[PDB]
Design a protein around this ligand. Structure first.
Ligand code: NI
Length: 341
């Protein structure tokens, strides 16, 4: 049964609610982004209207085989009427195709559902500038002050310089980047661009990347592994055993691996600056964990909320324990007292 924080009151709508069977009264199912916890339940047998971005729609059709007649893509930054209700989709700054949804309810209430997002000051100059929001359904993944991490630009600068140094010292080194979902593509694209290489990968991952509307993608990726010195591998293979096994398959072309594991936050963020990050090393294999986040830091989240000044906040992450719910409620009240709304 569908929980309350996935329903939009006063409408026939749900958000990211495909794992509950047929939801009573639902006339349109919104999907914020193509991550498995959110799409859980969709397939070729789904026969209700799905509303989403263009990119999410390409993934639903090609990867999950949802039939074309049930996929309803909407453009971004554009007022659209769905089942008699005005909606807008906004870029969430999460993975490719990810959106926030603004709903203009028939009674005058305005609701923003962030989906998953990485708040940014640029959002203060979207269509959100123009009006009041009564209810915010908020991605609270990192809603605690211990959650700190650098900008995505700093993290990419670190990865490019690390890869470029290693391969210039040793032309026979291979770079490997872990993946398990869409998102974080800048990590492997930036490294391959500095090395003058295409990115090599499986047929299955190539298919996924071909759905993402990335400009000039045919120039950047390939399924011919032997032609490439940046390889993508499943995240589970990014360990000394998996990497050893991969280096055997390359036919004595390479004699060293440098690997990257993009994570979210880890507690080594509580002590170490990005610049000071060191790898784990066994023999001719080195593995870097890099804190490339596609969710708001505490401070980015707080800035956004204090600017938007919502009347009520409904968290969508960390909702399962009393201690988490209490902690989030305390911070929301501080933020409101501090800013005066
Ligand atoms: Ni996500």
């Amino acid at each position: 049964t569908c929980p309350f924080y996935k329903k939009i009151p006063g409408t026939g709508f749900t958000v990211d609610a495909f794992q509950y069977g047929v939801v009573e009264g639902c006339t349109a199912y919104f999907l914020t982004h193509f991550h498995s916890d959110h799409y859980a339940g969709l397939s070729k047998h789904f026969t209700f209207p799905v509303y989403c971005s263009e990119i999410t729609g390409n993934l639903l059709k090609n990867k999950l085989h949802v039939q074309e007649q049930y996929i309803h893509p909407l453009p971004l930054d554009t007022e659209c009427i769905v089942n008699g209700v005005k909606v807008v989709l906004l870029d969430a700054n999460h993975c490719p195709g990810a959106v926030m949804i603004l709903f203009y309810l028939p009674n005058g209430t305005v609701i923003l559902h962030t989906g998953d997002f990485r708040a940014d000051p640029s959002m203060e100059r979207s269509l959100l500038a123009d009006q009041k929001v009564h209810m915010l359904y908020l991605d609270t993944t990192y809603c605690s002050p211990e959650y700190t991490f650098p900008s995505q630009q700093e993290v990419i600068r670190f990865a490019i310089n690390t890869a470029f140094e290693a391969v210039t010292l040793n032309p026979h080194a291979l770079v490997v980047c872990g993946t398990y979902s869409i998102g974080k593509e800048k990590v492997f694209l930036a490294i391959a661009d500095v090395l003058g290489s295409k990115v090599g990968m499986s047929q299955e991952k190539y298919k996924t990347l071909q759905c993402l509307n990335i400009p000039e993608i045919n120039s950047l990726i390939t399924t011919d592994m032997c032609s490439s010195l940046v390889h993508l591998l499943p995240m589970m293979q990014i360990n000394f055993k998996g990497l050893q096994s991969h280096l055997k398959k390359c036919g004595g072309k390479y004699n060293q691996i440098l690997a990257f594991r993009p994570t979210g936050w880890t507690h080594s963020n509580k002590f170490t600056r990005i610049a000071d990050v060191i790898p784990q090393t066994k023999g001719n294999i080195s593995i870097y964990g890099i804190p490339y986040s596609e969710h708001s830091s505490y401070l980015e989240m707080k800035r956004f909320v204090q600017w938007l000044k919502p009347q009520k906040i409904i968290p969508t992450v960390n909702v399962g324990t009393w201690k988490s719910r209490s902690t989030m409620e305390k911070y929301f009240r501080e933020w409101k007292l501090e800013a005066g709304y």
